[model samples]
Target chain A: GGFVAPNVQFSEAHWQGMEALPLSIELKRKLKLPLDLEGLLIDETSLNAAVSGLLAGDVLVAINGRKVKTLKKMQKETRRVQMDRRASLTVYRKGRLLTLTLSEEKNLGLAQVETAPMILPGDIMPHPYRGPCTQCHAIGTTGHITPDPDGIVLPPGPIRAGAKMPHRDRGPCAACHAIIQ
Target chain B: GGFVAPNVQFSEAHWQGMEALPLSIELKRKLKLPLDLEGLLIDETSLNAAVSGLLAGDVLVAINGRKVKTLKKMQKETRRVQMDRRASLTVYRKGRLLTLTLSEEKNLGLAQVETAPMILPGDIMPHPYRGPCTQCHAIGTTGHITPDPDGIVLPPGPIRAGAKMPHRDRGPCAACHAIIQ
Candidate 1:
């Protein structure tokens, strides 16, 4: 039996997205994986380390006897590799030489070893609050701010009549007070 | 089908010996065991921790609502217990309380928690000079007093007329020379 891969959550409204996803898929295809590749670059939320035996930093140096220098070369040579058969892989683990034989089920599920600083367009850091309170302040005006005795600026009191004041104080004052000024 | 407990090597030459083995068996018989009781004081050589989820510090308090204070009571109750069944065990892990359900094969294999220091009648420390040289020694020999120079007191030289000197000095000179002054 080939290696049984770990379950991945391809949640609704979101496709599986990882910086290394494409690279991982290409490597698995070259190895002719009988099972879905696991131990790849799982996203931050997933518990990949405990579930899968392999991890990042494990480098694949060879498949069978052919050298694996580039992804394209590996894909070309690995295409001939069959399922359910043993394919020897020379892996350099933490600078030490290691030989690993992967069967269809027991594959060296790997992610590409590449470092690319991702630069997403638009303001990555959240935009500072630009609410109405930031525009202008008016004394006695409902939506304006007020300074406490310590000079700490606080949000304005509730605008509606008979509306209780919301607790906005140090620590968890809201736990004790439904109404606070 | 009955619970098929994983294979345990109850090796030959000795029975499953426990300091409180006799007491534990009686107590379990009263509790009624569905299968031949395991997880009961497995010796040091066995992989009891991995096979059974229970460990030495865990105390078994109750089995299926019967108060289990003594091993004899547990053994008697356990004897009636059979395979392919589930029994609930209330245990104390550390100082906290924990309840564990054990199936015949998929059981929280447990033994009664008892203390008895294992002692042997004979000498505990190994006898020194276990090497073959201790058998005989020549009188008035200077090289005999000195241990082998290389720390390897080789065997006496061959009985044949011609043999190279393996080590000529220190202890066990007989290894190289049958006659050493």
Candidate 2:
């Protein structure tokens, strides 16, 4: 029941002076997981426009171009697949065609609604919420700003006085703060 | 930063009675992951037998009759889509229609392959080989037997007739084995 996560390792040693062991090649491959779908569970009723819109309630119709069904088919083919390769979807939105695309950066979506984030489980140690920033934070603090305050700001400083305003990069209000249903 | 996998409860009483403080909620979430696209990853390769006749090369193109350009759209719109949804795909196997359908169990010539299983940074565990039979052997080694022997089986089994099975259940692998892999 609850949640069976993944095996992970840190650069540090456990106990006292104990050297952390190396992950066996097979274990490393076996434990390696794709992003956990558990965190994808957001309130489907209240869809977020930015990234949530991307998750339009369409069931995946296909990948790359090959016809696929079931999660198993998805796994085997993805390994040799390249990150730059394109991913296609034949989404069913209210019984209509909703076409979609994907970049390696976007990853895959799961059925979770906001308990954690959408990153892989093993990599969650230092922190768990790991997927795309858009999944959680807005664009910038400008939040939705371009050349984002965090992504672009050099020396991590603002350019002008008020112009450098953070959070504003995306916008204000309901963006970060939930409306509390 | 340093090492913060401590076991302290917010309530001092619980903390006082505790020998090891539990991981933080954030840390717990980090550690507690659910099934991942690894399920999807292993499944895709297997689809070859069913659809190989419909396909030519490993390259995939369309889903439910849609073309894929990247992995993100596939994640948000297609792959995450539910089962029982009928869709079609067109692949450029030898430059033909390599169609299939998408379902919770079977893709009936609609969805594209390889795109079903999405991978991201940290999505995989540090090591999979370290996983133990005890991980799922809880409800009498029988609960973990889904569909029967995983596509394959390793490390033998308790299913053997005469071998005295653990009184009732085995312990957690992490309890004894150096499961770190």
Candidate 3:
């Protein structure tokens, strides 16, 4: 009947110099480190979780008939329903098509358990790294995707066609996204 | 003189939970806080010691030989001189035109003393709210001029049009600028 935002606090127990990542309420949920995962549950099985092939950094493009632009949007829709609901989610994970199915729990009389995911403070999320393919694709990776080698594409408008990914200034897996940046 | 960009760590200090403004070593010299009631220094004189009409935030436009769009550009062009040289600057302060001249310093040179005023860490910066406006007007409040409430002539942009300024949400700011966003 009652749920509130987590009242987690940052822990200085693990503080790295420049490499330190900040701890926040939202970040705890984001970082899947088994130690720092926690959330308030309304019902024992109000929400269901399933693993998908989508990468961690992927953006959710749409859910069912609604277009989801932000994390808040996705959460808002999920919180509105009870059980026995079916939904389909489309995500632009790592720039590919990914479909996820969400179905409500069958049993509603089950007693809720307190040992849900506990995302503790001071944990770094499963951070990611991303950049234009040309940054380290020594095989002319963008060229391979394009119609020809050395061809660049620039599209207009909100939704348009693809182009060659830009080469990050530093050619490393973590260069442009995080860590090395 | 050897001038270096101070390593200021910034993360949570941003506009409405967005990314903090990044600092460039090149932007230090030509920087000054808004010459408004907040009393930020634009020159050797103390901000509190100056007339209200002469604050740096009042700059509506400036006179330079080039199309300077960013504070970096203005800084780049203005700081290209040596100490003891006379420099003339065209400033659009208040609702009128004003021209101020500076005798570049030698020891604590203009470039050295006036290093990007906003370069300090989030804790030491003059005011944090400037980010909303800075990302738009860019060159202090000196980008474009518009009209005043009484239909009086002002800068070429919205602020001149008696707007709330910084114009972050509206059209004059970004969508025109992405890299900075």
Candidate 4:
């Protein structure tokens, strides 16, 4: 099978990043929206605009199989994707649930909708810091594979030449990397 | 006098809503930024763009009058302002600390910068819920001076205009809101 959708799962980091939202079932009922559908409202003009059939007022439910209940969870899952890899989205529009598959070109374009009270300053979810390298890197630090000191390596062989690692700081042991054993 | 910036103080609700952030002095030092300088980064095109000399990499240190040190505290303070009120901002840019005052028209246009890791989905501050009507009220239920059932005139003047309170369910005494003794 070629490129099967990865099993989306929330990691320990995901739970650590969880924010306790003041959302209540009563509030959703007051808005006349579906209950249990807490999420960021997608902008119609965003990157996934046309490709995903994601329209205005559509609530993002999940990304890459990870269930997104709060804006924080959505932000957490969004960072998991690699730039070159595709993202799977689950959205709820009106009374229908729609799923869309998109690439970085179209996927990266999606932005959250700005509404009153909910999306206001202090009230809205803080912008997720994807670190300094987000400008050029796809998945940011998550995609980079760090050199494990004990992992398999070419034992003193000079078969091929290699360039410097893209951005060494992205690895786990960036500080100790200088004194390579 | 043209304009005097108001004192930034944390309200009771503000303190109650605070969540512990994962940021630390050691981490900020690792990023080559000041350790004590905590706050969200500003979006270049946000409301503060023109009024404040906020650049892309500028970090916000305060909002309204409150000094924001962590993302959670920032979220707490962000809910303290009225739409009609002006907000004073403190930012750190290029190793310099600058202060800027802006109105809602300009201030509301500003957005938090989204970077990886810190602002990443699970990493960012959770949305702050002002509980129902934070627009005309402060802390909604907490601030409202409810008719103490025996406070003002009910049996004296001609009872003319009144209806079942909106979102009575939002308060604790939904079922007991009937029977105005």
B-chain TM-score of model 3: 0.31
Q: Find the candidate with the highest TM-score and give its number.
A: 4
The TM-scores, one per candidate, come to 0.21, 0.21, 0.20, 0.30
DockQ, each predicted model: 0.01, 0.02, 0.01, 0.02
Residue B132, model 4: lDDT of: 24
Among the numbered candidates, top lDDT falls to 4
Worst 10 residues of 2 chain A by lDDT: A10-19
Per-model chain B TM-scores are: 0.34, 0.29, 0.31, 0.39
Using TM-score as the measure, name the better of candidate 3 and candidate 4.
Answer: 4
lDDT, candidate 2, A1-181, per-residue tens: 1121241111111110011122222222233312221111101111111122233122344445654343334333433242233455444333454565544343322211101212232332332223443333212111011221223221222233234343326564344344333
Q: Positional deviation of A178 in candidate 3, in angstroms?
A: 39
Deviating ranges (above 4 Å) for candidate 1 = A1-181, B1-49, B104-181
Error of 2 at B104 (Å): 3.1
What's the C-alpha lDDT at position B178 in model 4? 45
lDDT of 1 by residue, B66-145 (tens): 76555545644443342224666665543565675554333222221221111122323232222222122111212111
- Displacement of the residue A69 alpha carbon in candidate 3, Å: 56
The residue-by-residue lDDT of candidate 3 on A41-146, one tens digit each, is: 1100101221222222233455565764433343344333322245565654323556876543331111111111122233233422223222212221111112
